[PDB]
């Protein structure tokens, strides 16, 4: 550990997705767009 | 799902409860008590 190939100390995250031992509730995002109106469209409103 | 409706007014007559906040929090539940 002191400053300076295989000693070379690196910083490393692992991650594991406790998602299935409870309910659901963080989420990716959901990008939205521009709503047009008086035309016949296809609207998908929170699901 | 935890889910928790009230109302407040001013007992006879009629009232419709509004939802409020509803918790995700998977938890096996059985007992409630007060804090007076």
């Given at each position: 550990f002191q400053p300076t190939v295989g000693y070379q100390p690196y910083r490393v995250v692992v991650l594991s997705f406790?998602?299935?031992?409870?309910?659901?509730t963080v989420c990716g995002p959901k990008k939205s767009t521009n709503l047009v109106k008086n035309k016949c469209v296809n609207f998908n409103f929170n699901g | 799902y935890f889910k928790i409706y009230s109302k407040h007014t001013p007992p006879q007559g009629f009232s419709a409860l509004e939802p409020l906040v509803d918790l995700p929090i998977g938890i096996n539940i059985t007992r409630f008590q007060t804090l007076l």
């Amino acid at each position: 550990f002191q400053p300076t190939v295989g000693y070379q100390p690196y910083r490393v995250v692992v991650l594991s997705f406790e998602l299935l031992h409870a309910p659901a509730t963080v989420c990716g995002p959901k990008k939205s767009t521009n709503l047009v109106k008086n035309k016949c469209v296809n609207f998908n409103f929170n699901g | 799902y935890f889910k928790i409706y009230s109302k407040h007014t001013p007992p006879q007559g009629f009232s419709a409860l509004e939802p409020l906040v509803d918790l995700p929090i998977g938890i096996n539940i059985t007992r409630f008590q007060t804090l007076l």
